[PDB]
Each structure stands twice: as C-alpha cells, then as structure tokens.
Design a protein around this ligand. Structure first.
Ligand SMILES: Nc1ncnc2c1ncn2[C@@H]1O[C@H](COP(=O)(O)OP(=O)(O)O)[C@@H](O)[C@H]1O
Ligand code: BEF
Ligand SMILES: [Mg+2]
Lengths: 420, 765, 58
C-alpha cells in the first residue's frame, strides 16, 4: 500500500517503527530464555500437542510459556485494575490522590508499580508451585523455598523488565507500550497455532469457512469498536459569533462498548474461584459437581459465563463512564446538553444513554467471549486455537490505535499554505 | 564545569583592565570603532570578549563611579553565552547586563534589554545609557506612549530598553501593517531579559492579544447587571473560592428564567442571555474593586496581577470589561475582536539569542532547560548576605495580623529604622495606611493609584524614619538606597504581610531589604484567613483554628500550621506549573500556523511583483473547483459540467467566456489547462489596461485583506476548539492529538478560503 | 409490558450511534488483516531465526 511507503519516507516515523520492531525482537529473545532451576525437559514433555520451542507448551488448550517472561505484563494489568477499583470510594487516600491532579496521579502510578512488583511475586510463587504440581513435583529441581524464591524473583524481574520495555517503546517507539507488548504476545502465539491446524490436516473448505468467519468477526469488531454515540454539548462561555459552522462541533462521545475487555476479567475470576476453592478440599461429590458446572465449555457453565459478562459489563461501564462525575464536570466547566439542566438532569440523561449502549456492548462482548467454544465445537478445530476470543478485541484495538497514532504523526508534515 | 571557565575569563578581564586604565576619553571611545572594524574584518564576539569587557569596566568607572566586581564579569560572561545568570537580589545585575549588551551591539543588529515594567526600563535606560553613550553607541527606550516614528527611532538604536509587553505588541503590530516601511522592529537578534523568571515563567502563563473594536451592544449588559444586583449570595449563586467561579443555583436559574420571561435559560437561542448573566455574576462576585481593577476618570483600569500597576490600554475579554463597567455605573464601551495573539514563550523563542538574569532562578531551572534551552548559572556574591530572614508570624485572624503589623511598624519607627511594608492589593494597602494614620506614623503609600510619585518615594524610602507601604510595585526590582545612619540601625526592615504565589516572589521582597552586604530584617506576618490559606489550604488543617483559641495577640506557635502554609504555596506553584505547560503545547499548535501565515503575508508585502503569487492562488482555487465537480467515481458524463461552467463564469471568466462544448468529455487536467490559459490572457489584458504598479497595489490590497480577515476568523475558531478539547479527552483519546488534527484541517480550509477569495476578487474586478 | 418498550428504545438508540461507513470499514479491515498477517510472518521468521541461533550457540 501507498501509506506504508509514506511512513518509511518520513524519517521520524520510520525511526520509531524500527525501534518498536527491535524492542519486539528483544521481547521474543527473552521469551526464549529459560528460568534458573526449572528443568526444561519435563516441561516440554507436559504438553498435549507439539508447540515450537522448548519453553512453549500446549496446556489446557492454551499456548503456555515458562521463560523469564512467563507472566508477561499480566501483574501490571491486574495491579492497574485493582488500583482503579480502589480509587472509587474504597480507599480514601487514593481518592484524594486522584483528586490532586498530574502529581497525585504520579503517586498512583508509583503505587501501581510497587503493587505490580508485589503481585508479580505472589503470582510467580503460585505459578511455579502450580506448574511443579502439574509436572508431578518433577518440574523444579531442589524443591526448597530458596529455589522457589529465586524463581519468583527472576519472573518478577522479567515482568519488571517488560514494563521498562513498555516505557521505552512508548517514549521512543510507535505507540503505547504495554499494549504493543500484549499485542506481541497474542500474535506471536499465532504461528504455532497455524502450525497445529496444518498438522491436523471437506476440511479445506471447512478451514476456508473458518477464515471467512474470522474476517467477518474482525469486521464486526471494528464496527462496534469504532462507533460513538455523540451527545452534543453546548458551552455558554464564549460569544461564538461570525457564522459558527456546526461541522466540527463540540460533543461528548460515548463508546458502544465503554468497558472494553475488563468485564471478562471479572467474569473469569468468578468462574475460576469455585474450582480452586473446591480443589483445596480434595475430591468429593460436590467438588466434582463444582468442577463440572463451572466449566464454560458446557452449557450450564457457558450460561453462567455469559450472565456474568453482561452483569460486569454494566458494572464496569458505569464505573468507567461514571455519569455522576460526568454531570458534575459538565456543570463545573459550564457546558450543558442542549435542553437539559446541567445538574441531576444531565446525569440521568446520560445514564439512560449508557443503559442502552451498554446493553448492545455487553451482548457483543459476551458473544465475542463465547465464540471460540463454538468454533472449536462446530469446526473440528483443535482446542489449542482459542480463535476469536477477547484476544481478538485486543489485537484489533491495538492495531487500529497504533495506525491512528502514526497518521497523526504523519499529518504534521503536510501544512500546505496558499502559495505552495 | 562552566563556573571555573567564568572565573578564568573574569581574571583575564582583571589583568587587561589593569592595561586599559590610563587611557583618555576619545581614546576609550575610539575602542568602539576599533572593535567594530575588527568585528567586520574577521573576528567574532567571543574573541573580543575580554577586551570589550575591560573597556566597559573602565567606561563604567569613568561614568557612574561603579567599577564592576569580578562576579559581575562572571555574570556578564554567563549572559553572553546565552545562559541565565542567577546573581542574588541586590548584587548589581544592571552593570552585568551592560557588559554583554555592549559586546553584542557592536555588530549593528540591535540588542533588546527587556525589563518588567516601565519604571525599571526608564531607570536602567538612563543610567546604563549614560555608560553606552560614553562608549559611543545609541540607546533607545521603547515606551507604551510613543508614536510609531519614535518607536522606529528607538528600535533603530544600538541598544533598546523596553518592557516585555511593548516588545510583544510591537511584534504583533508589525505583522498587521500594509507597507514594509511601517514596521518599527528590526529583525530580532539578542534579548537580555532582566527578571527572567517573572517574564519567562510567571507572566508566560498569559498571551499577548491585540484586539480591534467590534460593534457595541449595551442593553443586555444593563439588563443582566440589574438582574444580578438582586441575587442573595448563598441561595442563588455559589462562589467557589478555590477557582473563582460563580455559578447560579437552581433557585437562581429559576429566578433568571422568571426575570427575563424565557422558559429555558439553557436553550441555544438564549446563549447570549446566559453569557451576559454569567459575566455579570463574575463581575459582581469574583472581581473585587480595588483588588482587580480601579476606577480612574470614569474608566475601569486593570491592575496587573504580576507587576501591580495599571494596564491602561488593556481590557478584559469576552464581555467582562463591559460587565464591570455596567456594575460600576460607567459608560459601556464597544466589544472587541482578537486580531493577533502570541505568547511570551513563542515570542522570545524567535530571538536568535536569548539571555537573562534574575535573583530567583534555581528552583525553575529544569523549566528553563525544557523550553528555552537555557542553563541557569549561579554566580557568587563577593560580599555575604547579612540580611536577617526571620520566620513567619502566623496569626488566627486578619485583624490580629494587621494589629501586629502596625505594632511592629510603630516600634521600628521609634528607633529610626526605615520600614517597607509589602502588601499585594490596593485596598489592603489603604487599610494598613489608615491603620498607621491613627497611631500617628507618617508614611508613604505606593499603590497602583500612586504611580506618579514612585521615583520620589523610592528615593526617600531608605532614609531615617521612613515608613513605606507598597504593593507588588516595589517588590521586584526596586533599588532602595540607605540614608545616613540607617546602616547602623540595620536599615530597611521589610515587613511582608502575605505569602505570594511562589517562593520567588517573596524572596524578591526580602531582596528589597538585603542590598549587597548591608544589614536588613525581613519578617513576614501571615494569617490563617489569608487568601492563600483560604483558597489553597487543605481542609484538614483548616479545622483546628478553633483549637488554637480566639485571642490573636501572640502568633500560633504550632508546627502543623507551618506545614499547611508551605503546602498551600506548593499547591499554587504546582497549579501554575501545569497551567503554563498546557498553554505551551496548545500554543505550539497555533505557533506553527501563525509562523506560516506571517511569513507568507510578509513576503506578499515586500514583493515587487505579485503576478506569480496571484496566479498560483487562482490555479489552486481552480484545481479545487475542477475536482469539486468531476469526481474520480462517476467518470462517463455524470459530471454536471454545466454547473462547472456556471461556476467558472461566476468566479473566473466574466459571465460568458465558457460553454459546455469547450470542456465536454475532457480530462480534468486538460480542461484545467484550457481554463487556466484563458485566465492568463484575461490577466494579461487586466495588467495591460489597469497599469503595472497600480495592478500590484490593487492585488496587494486584495491579498492582504483576505489573509487578515480569514486569519482573524481562524484565531476565533481555534479558541473555540480549545474550549471543547478536554471534553474530547472523555472518549479515551489524547485530546492534544485531536487538537492538532482538527487545527490542521481548520487551517487548510482557511487557506483554501484565502485562495478562493483572492481568485474571485482579482478575476471578477 | 415494559420490556418491549425498552427494546424499542434500544433500537431507537442504535440509530443515533455514528457507525463507521463502508469505505472506512474496508480500510480498517485492510489495516487489521495487514497488521495480523505481517506480524504472523514476522514472528514466525524471528522464531525460526532465534531457534537456529540457539541451535548454534546452545
Ligand atoms: N560594581 C558595583 N560597585 C558599586 N555598586 C554597585 C556595583 N554594582 C551594583 N552596584 C549597586 O548595587 C545596587 C544593586 O542594584 P541592582 O543592580 O538594581 O540590583 P539587581 O541586581 O536586583 O537589579 C545598585 O544600587 C547599584 O548602584
Ligand atoms: F533587580 Be534585582 F533581582 F534586585
Ligand atoms: Mg534589576
């Protein structure tokens, strides 16, 4: 295409594209490096398929990885969503820190980094112990607590290195940092999944139907993700004379899916917590029943999963948008929806807008989240695929946002002038 | 390390000032001629630095009696390098300005010495102009009251002393001229900015804006002022003390809709009434009379927030000045209309070399590194600071604080030590003057209203037994000299009465006391209902002022109130930091647009033939008119080409000269070339009949009028966009990127309109 | 029957949403499929390269 040749003609855009690709090569290089005392052959023997590499296994229908980047930035994700939930009328110090401005925000960012290190340590301990139980105690050689804390501190060092790499690739690179690293994790898992689907193989036309359905779902995801309900906003603090246009008018855009993917975080925590607390109690009748009904590849568990995605989309849409804080900010800065009094009436106006938009966005999110179950069941795919889950939403969003960032860097060169 | 370099160069200057001493005048005035021809043959200013500085040292000892110390030479070398010389208050920064100003005015391109107000500019211009006119250069002083010819003579001199407002407004008015010979300024070459942190940090929060008067309305101002004057300060409006925002309550909105006969105040047909009600609220509640303005000769005159003096030409924007004039019962003037805008960052970053000196730079050092690429260099003092900075005396009420201040001033007046009390507003200064009137203490007051006697008051303010109450006017650059016996009493006790918006500003007040190794006391008397504590104090510590009791004869001897005072001042400093950062990046967008427009408008002005410029404008307008019809999609004859023929005959080619047959079935570029060569021969007939230079005058007027009108509309539309852009941040975008993209689209549509207007007005006239 | 009134309101609300038109829908799908295909090939090639270098160095 012409536009990717226009990018490489500007030197700054090409400079940060090449820096981003070098940081992704660094991330992949580190994903090949094993952990200290983890005895890689029993790890590579644990899988149910044949992945590429020795640290990549196909466990639980997912491409698991046990390098020094085994956690990825997942502790940063869960630390940020916990800190964000704590800002909203639970911990008061965080509330006033958010209320301060761009310096109390730095206090919240510092707390999120320290909480990231703490949660990365706890997750690395749980992950190494659970993987060692999965291998039968054979995964860790010398299973003493000094070796577990060595493994935990090196996985936490890997995750903190990935966060530094994200800071680099957002300072000197193409876009957001952590989002590019998450995108890299997903689409670096893609080629071995394609190799498994090839190593499996009416089937050629079945995979052609699957690829056409994947392009159809990518089009539907772009359609919902790029759609805003634009509420018009009128400001009554400038004279606005001399024929105001009306084309670039001020508005307040609400997304159709304002929550994002975070409702699936809350729904899968609600779906994994009963099997772990039943796994601590040993095998019984009710332990096996809890394990059988909270498994979302079977219709009772899929129904509980869909219901929790819809309910947590409503909760997190009203957490993310917060129509009361929106109405107060609109009243304070002097704007108003035309026709609606700027106090409580705009709060309940945009509350009604948010109820309807959140219904459509929650149904889209639940359908996207239970799509890979249907592709695996009704396309005879291997269960390794997870083809069209919320990783599809993450991939589409990061691709489109990086493209928009690049075109915004591009247009600063094209200031024409009437003389030319 | 650069400070050892500055010490080395200062010792070099010391050796050769040993050499330069026994030279007559006319042999020391000849050194300027010698340096000018050596600077024209092959030398640079950096090679001439030690001989030029030794010549200025000797000339200064011959004229003013002052022979600059070696720390003044170190500050002069730090100013020649383009850095910021942070010499302390009282140290002698005016002579250290005269060293690199002489060195950099030898090339003939002009040096601007910028100061904060016109008292300091005229004072420094007089003394240091005596030095420079001994040496043989020419010193102009650019004031607000001069005409354009006197301003052109001031900028044509070798060294020009002005304030930052006049330099900014002269730049903005030079890009609104019609002839090149109406510009007063020369190309901008070197600026030595005295009090850099006032000008480049504090006052850089604001833009300079040249307006021109629009049509007058008056009935809605009197109507909204008569409404707001009956409005019950707690039921019908809330005044937010933190950010001084006055808003109606729902009871007040109901009363507004009843008083004006409307049904909804928040419609889109009542946006003018809502604007007038809001500006009458701000004029009544948030704009107090002797704090924010004054009424002089039936006019509302703005008291400047930084300099503390009256800004005579300046008026409040967006109808606030007219609401204040309706509030005060004065004659309501016309509206205004922004013609030009610049910020002080974007003005002083045009200057090819920028230096500066101040007393209080080090805390803002990284800001000076991030924007201006200037490095704060700290200079020693040559005599230690013997000034006594006592800690603040915090009180419960303002009446107890002011009783304490008057008691302190009374017991320092009894010994004979001169006192300088430092307030901020004009009304608190008159309050403390009447607090010393009874108690029988003879004083002087230096308000914004008492600016005529200022140079007299400062000459008596350091005598024996001299009380001076002074607002922000005094505490920035004022040099109070001590009288006889006053240095034995520990002369000039400065008694501040409030914390300012930074530590730099109250350090400048203390610097009024210090003054190069002389003794001096600086006591601040704060209060707990001071405006800094009421507006920015945290609500925890604002609860126990009942715990401290209600007496106010002795100060609060706590350590939780001192932490509250310091944290409130740091909160103001952080707010101002972020506000000036925001103004910086959004005026970087408008800076790129303004630099393009102003450069091309200037080369419209000094172009002795405009045929190529106007023809490229007509061709660009014509290409867009061709491509507005004739799109890429519907190629075979769904192209509506008689509409295009009608457009060409209404815009370019005099009503009959094109039919459908001339452009039927043609490629867009060949019909463009056909219409374009018809336009060229029509232009050649116009240039033949109309004249040759008369045609250039005609289309220069057309082009400049189009550029000016569309650029004023673009400044307005760009302001409206910057109003709504944080609301764009509600949709999880970066709002600065949205501002940049919509500003680019708006700018390019503006230039298309310029080309369309110039094409139509040239071809159809 | 409140729920059918609510679903009529949802359908009425979806017509005020500013959905992407077909031109930018096709351009967006082109960008997404180009990014996914390029990074699939890029990551397969650097996995092969790191695997050969790992086989060399051990
Ligand atoms: N080299 C010198 N010798 C004697 N007096 C000096 C010398 N340099 C400055 N002074 C005096 O010291 C005072 C310092 O004032 P000024 O230079 O205005 O302070 P600031 O540095 O804050 O502008 C001035 O009154 C000036 O007359
Ligand atoms: F002119 Be100074 F900073 F006292
Ligand atoms: Mg000075």
């Amino acid at each position: 295409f012409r536009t990717i040749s226009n990018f490489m003609r500007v030197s700054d855009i090409r400079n940060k594209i090449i820096f981003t690709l070098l940081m992704l090569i660094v991330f992949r290089i580190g994903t090949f490096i094993p952990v200290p005392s983890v005895n890689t052959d029993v790890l590579k023997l644990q899988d149910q398929l044949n992945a590429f590499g020795v640290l990549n296994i196909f466990c639980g229908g997912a491409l698991q990885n046990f390098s020094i980047f085994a956690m990825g930035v997942m502790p940063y994700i869960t630390a940020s969503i916990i800190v964000q939930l704590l800002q909203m009328d639970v911990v008061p110090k965080f509330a006033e820190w958010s209320k301060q401005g761009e310096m109390g925000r730095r206090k919240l960012a510092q707390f999120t980094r320290y909480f990231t290190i703490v949660l990365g340590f706890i997750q690395a301990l749980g992950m190494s112990y659970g993987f060692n139980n999965l291998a039968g105690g054979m995964l860790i050689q010398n299973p003493g607590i000094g070796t577990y804390l060595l493994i935990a501190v090196v996985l936490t060092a890997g995750t903190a290195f990935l966060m530094w790499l994200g800071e680099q690739i957002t300072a000197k690179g193409v876009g957001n940092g952590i989002s590019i690293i998450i995108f890299a994790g997903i689409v670096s898992g893609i080629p071995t999944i394609l190799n498994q689907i090839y190593a499996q193989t009416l089937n050629i036309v079945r995979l052609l139907l699957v690829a056409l359905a994947v392009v159809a779902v990518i089009v539907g995801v772009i359609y919902i993700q790029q759609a805003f309900r634009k509420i018009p906003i009128q400001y009554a603090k400038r004279l606005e004379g001399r024929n105001p246009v009306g084309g670039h008018s001020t508005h307040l855009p609400l997304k159709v899916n304002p929550a994002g993917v975070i409702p699936v975080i809350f729904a899968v925590s609600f779906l994994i917590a009963p099997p772990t607390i039943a796994s601590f109690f040993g095998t019984n009748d009710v332990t096996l029943w809890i394990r059988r009904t909270f498994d979302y590849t079977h219709p009772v568990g899929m129904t509980i999963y869909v219901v929790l995605i819809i309910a947590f989309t409503y909760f997190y849409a009203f957490v993310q948008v917060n129509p009361e804080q929106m109405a107060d900010n609109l009243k304070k800065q002097g704007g108003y929806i035309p026709g609606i009094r700027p106090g409580k009436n705009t709060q309940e106006y945009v509350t009604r807008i948010l109820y309807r938009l959140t219904l459509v966005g929650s149904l889209f999110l639940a359908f996207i989240a239970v799509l890979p179950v249907f592709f695996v069941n009704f396309a005879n795919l291997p269960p390794s695929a997870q083809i069209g889950g919320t990783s599809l939403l993450i991939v589409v969003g990061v691709a489109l946002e990086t493209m928009k960032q690049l075109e915004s860097q591009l247009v600063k060169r094209h200031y024409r002038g009437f003389i030319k | 390390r650069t400070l050892n370099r500055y010490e080395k160069i200062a010792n070099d200057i010391d050796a050769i000032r040993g050499d330069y001493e026994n030279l007559s005048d006319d042999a020391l005035k000849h050194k300027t001629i010698e340096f000018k021809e050596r600077l024209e043959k092959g030398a640079t200013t950096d090679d001439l630095l030690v001989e030029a500085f030794a010549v200025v040292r000797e000339a200064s000892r011959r004229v003013t009696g002052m022979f600059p110390f070696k720390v003044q030479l170190m500050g002069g070398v730090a100013l020649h390098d383009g850095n910021i010389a942070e010499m302390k208050t009282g140290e002698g920064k005016t002579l250290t300005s005269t060293l690199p100003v002489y060195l950099n005015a030898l090339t003939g391109k002009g040096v601007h010495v910028v100061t904060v107000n016109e008292y300091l500019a005229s004072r420094d211009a007089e003394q240091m102009g005596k030095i420079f006119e001994f040496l043989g250069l020419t010193v102009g002083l650019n004031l607000n009251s001069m005409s354009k010819d006197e301003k052109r003579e001031a900028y044509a001199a070798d060294i020009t002393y002005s304030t930052n407002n006049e330099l900014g407004f002269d730049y903005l008015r030079d890009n609104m001229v019609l002839y090149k010979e109406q510009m007063v300024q020369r190309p901008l070459h070197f600026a030595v900015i005295d009090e850099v942190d006032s000008i480049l940090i504090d006052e850089a929060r604001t833009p300079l804006i040249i307006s021109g008067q629009a049509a007058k309305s008056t009935k809605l101002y009197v109507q909204a002022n008569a409404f707001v004057r009956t409005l019950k300060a707690e039921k019908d409006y809330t005044y937010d003390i933190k950010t001084k925002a006055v808003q109606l309550t729902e009871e007040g909105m109901t009363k507004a809709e009843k008083a004006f006969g409307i049904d909804n105040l928040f419609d889109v047909k009542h946006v003018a009434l809502n604007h007038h009600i809001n500006q009458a609220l701000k004029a009544h509640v948030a704009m107090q009379k002797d704090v924010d303005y004054v009424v002089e000769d039936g006019q509302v005159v703005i008291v400047d927030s930084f300099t503390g003096r009256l800004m005579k030409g300046r008026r409040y924007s967006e109808g606030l000045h007219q609401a204040i004039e309706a509030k005060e019962g004065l004659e309501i003037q016309n509206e205004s209309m922004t013609l030009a805008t610049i910020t002080f960052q974007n003005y002083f970053r045009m200057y090819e070399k920028l230096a500066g000196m101040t007393g209080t730079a080090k805390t803002e050092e990284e800001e000076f590194r991030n924007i201006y690429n200037m490095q704060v260099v700290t200079i020693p003092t040559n005599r230690p600071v013997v000034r006594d900075d006592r800690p603040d005396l915090i009180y419960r009420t303002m009446e107890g604080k002011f009783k304490a201040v008057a008691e302190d001033v009374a017991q320092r007046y009894m010994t004979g030590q001169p006192v300088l009390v430092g307030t901020v507003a004009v009304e608190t200064s008159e309050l403390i003057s009447k607090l010393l009137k009874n108690k029988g203490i003879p004083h002087q007051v230096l308000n914004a209203k008492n600016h005529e006697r200022e140079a007299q008051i400062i000459e008596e303010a350091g005598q024996k037994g001299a009380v001076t109450i002074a607002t922000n006017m005094a505490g920035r650059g004022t040099d109070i000299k001590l009288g006889e016996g006053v240095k034995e009493l520990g002369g000039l006790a400065v008694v501040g009465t409030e914390r300012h918006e930074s530590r730099r500003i109250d350090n400048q007040l203390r610097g009024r006391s210090g003054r190069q190794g002389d003794p001096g006391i600086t006591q601040f008397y704060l209060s707990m209902e001071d405006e800094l504590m009421r507006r920015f104090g945290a609500e925890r510590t604002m609860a126990m002022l009942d715990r401290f009791g209600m007496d106010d004869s002795t100060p609060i001897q706590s350590k939780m109130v001192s932490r509250a005072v310091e944290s409130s001042q740091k909160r103001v400093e952080g707010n101002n930091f972020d506000s000036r950062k925001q103004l910086l990046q959004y005026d970087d967008v408008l800076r790129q647009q303004r630099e393009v427009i102003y450069k091309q408008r200037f080369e419209v002005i000094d172009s002795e033939n405009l045929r190529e410029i106007v023809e490229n404008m007509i061709k660009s307008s014509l290409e867009r008119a061709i491509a507005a019809y004739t799109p890429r999609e519907e190629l075979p004859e769904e192209w509506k080409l008689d509409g295009l023929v009608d457009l060409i005959n209404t815009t370019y080619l005099d009503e009959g000269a094109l039919e459908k047959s001339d452009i039927f079935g043609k490629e867009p570029d060949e019909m463009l070339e056909l219409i374009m060569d018809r336009i060229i021969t029509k232009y050649n007939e116009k240039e033949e009949q109309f004249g040759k230079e008369q045609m250039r005058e005609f289309e220069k007027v057309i082009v400049l009028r189009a550029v000016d009108s569309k650029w004023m509309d673009h400044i307005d539309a760009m302001d409206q966009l910057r109003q709504g852009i944080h609301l764009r941040a509600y949709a999880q975008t970066n709002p600065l990127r949205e501002y940049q993209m919509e500003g680019f689209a708006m700018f390019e549509h503006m230039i298309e309109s310029i080309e369309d207007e110039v094409a139509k007005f040239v071809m159809k006239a | 029957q409140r729920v059918t009134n609510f679903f009529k309101e949802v359908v009425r609300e979806l017509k005020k949403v500013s959905w992407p038109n077909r031109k930018e829908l096709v351009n967006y799908t082109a960008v997404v499929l180009a990014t996914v295909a390029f990074f699939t090939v890029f990551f397969a090639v650097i996995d092969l390269g790191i695997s050969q270098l790992i086989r060399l160095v051990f």
